[PDB]
Amino acid sequence: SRYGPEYKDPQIDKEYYRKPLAEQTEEEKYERDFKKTQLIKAAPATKTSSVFEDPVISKFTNMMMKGGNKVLARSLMTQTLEAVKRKQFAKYHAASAEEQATIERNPYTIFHQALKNCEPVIGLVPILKGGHFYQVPVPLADRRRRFLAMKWMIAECREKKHRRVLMPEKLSQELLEAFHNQGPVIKRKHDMHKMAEANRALAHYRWW
Amino acid sequence: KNRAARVRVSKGDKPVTYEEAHAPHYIAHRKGWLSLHTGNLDGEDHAAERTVEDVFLRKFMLGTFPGCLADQLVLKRRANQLEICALVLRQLPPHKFYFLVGYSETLLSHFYKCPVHLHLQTVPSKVVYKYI
C-alpha cells in the first residue's frame, strides 16, 4: 500500500520475455505495458525465476509457518519432499517389475496429485432464516478449494500425531495415503460431500 | 477537540494577531519560535534556567509596560547578553517610554547578573492577520 494503485504487478516468467516474436496481441499488450510508463512493483523475495519454483509448494510452505520462520518452514517442507522421495525409492526396490512401471518416484507429482485428490467439490455456507442457521450447499471457486485442501492437510498432520513423531514424516504419510485416496484427509472431504447431500433440499435457500 | 493555545472562531468580527491565529501544530512550519537560546540542542546544559528566566521576563514586561504591549515578547540570548525585542503599542508619551527603557535594562541586568539590551518597535495599532 506504499504502492499507489498506479503500480501494476510484475510478470516474472522468463519464457514470456525471451520468445515474443510469434504473438501479435501479446506484443501489443506488453508494448502497452512498458510504454504506458507503468510504475511496476519491486518483485517479491519469495518469487524467483528459478526453474525449480512451484507456487503451490510455496503457498503450502507459508501456511505451515508459525511466527516469522521461513527458514523453519522451508526446512520442514524440504524434509517432507525428501521423506516422500526416499520412502518411494524404498517401495520401488522392494517391488516387482510391473509395480516398478507403476510407482511414482516424483515427490512433486505426488504432491499435486495428493492435493487434487483432497479438494472438495462443494462446500457449506450458513444461511440465517427465521432464526435458525441452515448449512447450505455452495459451489466453490478453485482457489478457495485449493486452500481448503492445504489447510486440511496442515491441520490434520499438525493435530493428530503422537508427539514423538516429527512433522515431515507424518506429512509424508498423509501425502502418500491421500495419493491412494485412503487417507483421513479424504475422509474429511467426504464428510463435506455427505453433509452437502443431506442438506441438498436447502440449496433453494441460497439466492446468489 | 484540542483546546491548546488556540483562538476560537467568533461571529467573524474578532481581530487576531498573526501569532494567535496560528495553532500549535504550526510551530516550525509557518510560525517561528518566540525565544532563542542554546539550551535545547543535543549536548547542552542549563535549559531550565533560561526557561524560568524567559517566563519571568514575560510577566515582567507585561507588568512594567501596562496596556501598551502589542504582541508576545521576543527573547534572544546571544553570548551571555539578552536581546529583548518588543512590539509595543503607542499610548505613552515618549518620555515615559525612555524612563522605562532605562528602568528595565538596569533592573534586569542587575537581577540576572548579565547585560541586557532592550528594543521597542512602536506600532499604531495591533496588526490584524485575520477577520476584522
Partner: protein
C-alpha cells in the same frame, strides 16, 4: 507565587463564566503607588523651573488625599454604572410594541432618511429544532416606518441576536413603501370594510377633533402614515402581522374623489353639517362632465354590518365602549 499568578483577561473569562466586567486598567497612572514615590518621568514632568527633578516622596497626608481621590473615582464609576437605567416605553413596560427604533440606515446611494420614524409592532421569540443544538432560538421583529407625509411601509426581520433583528427590519422596511392617500391630510377618504385572512378590519372616516381611535398597533401605524383621525375596530384574530398587512392593503384599496369623479364623470360634492346646506365641491371630472342624472333608488342594495346598525339605534350598551382614554 509570583509564578502562580496570571493575566487579567484570563481571570475575567474564568470569573464571568460565559462558556459584569469591571476593568482595573482604569484610574491608575504610570508610577502611581501607595508608598508614594514621585518618579521624574511619570508622576511628575521631567523638569521644573530648575532642571532634572530628583526622586521624591510625598507626605503621609498628600498620599491620604490621592488615595481618597482614587476611592471617590471608584465611587463615581459605580454610580455611573447604576445610573445607566433609563428608557422610553412603547406600549407597556417590557412590551417592545410601539417603541421608537430610530431612523433607518442610509442606503448605498447616499440616500438618507432623517424623516422616517420607525416603530416596533411585534417582537417575538421564535424557536426551531436543530439536530445539533436541540432548540434554536431566533428573534423576529415586525417593524413599520413612515414619514408622516403619507408614504409608509413595514417589514419583518429575524436574527439570533435581537439587536441584529431590529436593524434588519428597519432596512428591509424602507424597501416596501406604500403611498397612503389622505383626505384633507388627516382621515381616510371613505369607510373601509376589509376581510383579510381570518381578520376583519373596519374603519370609519372621522371629522377633525376626533383623534385616532384604534387598535394600539393601528394607532402606531397611523401616526407613522400621518393619519390623525380614525375609527378602527378589529374583528377575529388579532395577530400582529395579518393586521398590519390587512391595514395596508385596505388603505391602498382606497378610491380617491378624483377617481370617483373620473369613472362616474360627475361632480362630487361635500355636504358639511356645520356649514349647513352649502354644497361644497370637492372634485370635478377632468374631461366631459355628464349631462345624465343618476338613478335614485328608494331602496339601495348594500352590505350592511349589523354592528353599525346596532350602533345606530342605541343598542351598543357595552360599558367599555364610551370610555374616556388618554390623548391620541
Amino acid at each position: 507565587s509570583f509564578f502562580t499568578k496570571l493575566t487579567a483577561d484570563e481571570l475575567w473569562k474564568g470569573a464571568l463564566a460565559e462558556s459584569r466586567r469591571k476593568d482595573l486598567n482604569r484610574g491608575q497612572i504610570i508610577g502611581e503607588g501607595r508608598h508614594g514615590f514621585l518618579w521624574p518621568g511619570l508622576n511628575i514632568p521631567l523638569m521644573r523651573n530648575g532642571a532634572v527633578q530628583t526622586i521624591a516622596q510625598r507626605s503621609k497626608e498628600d498620599q491620604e488625599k490621592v488615595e481618597a481621590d482614587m476611592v471617590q473615582q471608584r465611587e463615581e464609576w459605580d454610580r455611573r454604572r447604576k445610573m445607566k437605567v433609563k428608557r422610553e416605553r412603547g406600549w407597556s413596560g417590557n412590551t417592545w410594541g410601539g417603541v421608537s427604533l430610530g431612523p433607518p440606515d442610509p442606503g448605498p446611494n447616499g440616500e438618507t432618511y432623517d424623516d422616517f420614524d420607525t416603530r416596533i409592532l411585534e417582537v417575538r421569540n421564535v424557536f426551531n429544532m436543530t439536530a445539533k443544538e436541540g432548540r434554536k432560538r431566533s428573534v423576529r421583529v415586525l417593524v413599520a416606518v413612515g414619514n408622516g407625509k403619507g408614504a409608509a411601509g413595514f417589514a419583518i426581520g429575524k436574527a439570533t441576536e435581537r439587536a441584529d433583528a431590529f436593524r434588519k427590519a428597519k432596512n428591509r422596511a424602507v424597501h416596501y413603501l406604500h403611498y397612503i392617500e389622505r383626505y384633507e391630510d388627516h382621515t381616510i377618504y371613505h369607510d373601509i370594510s376589509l376581510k383579510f385572512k381570518r381578520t376583519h378590519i373596519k374603519m370609519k372616516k372621522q371629522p377633525r377633533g376626533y383623534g385616532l381611535h384604534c387598535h394600539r398597533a393601528i394607532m402606531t401605524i397611523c401616526r407613522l402614515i400621518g393619519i390623525k383621525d380614525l375609527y378602527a375596530k378589529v374583528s377575529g384574530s388579532v395577530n400582529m402581522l395579518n393586521l398590519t398587512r390587512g391595514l395596508f392593503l385596505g388603505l391602498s384599496r382606497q378610491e380617491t374623489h378624483q377617481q370617483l369623479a373620473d369613472k362616474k364623470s360627475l361632480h362630487v360634492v361635500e355636504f358639511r353639517e356645520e356649514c349647513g346646506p352649502l354644497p361644497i365641491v370637492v372634485a370635478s371630472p377632468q374631461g366631459a362632465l355628464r349631462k345624465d342624472p343618476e338613478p335614485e333608488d328608494e331602496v339601495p342594495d348594500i352590505t350592511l354590518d349589523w354592528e353599525d346598525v346596532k350602533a345606530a339605534q342605541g343598542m351598543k350598551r357595552s360599558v367599555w365602549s364610551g370610555l374616556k382614554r388618554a390623548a391620541t
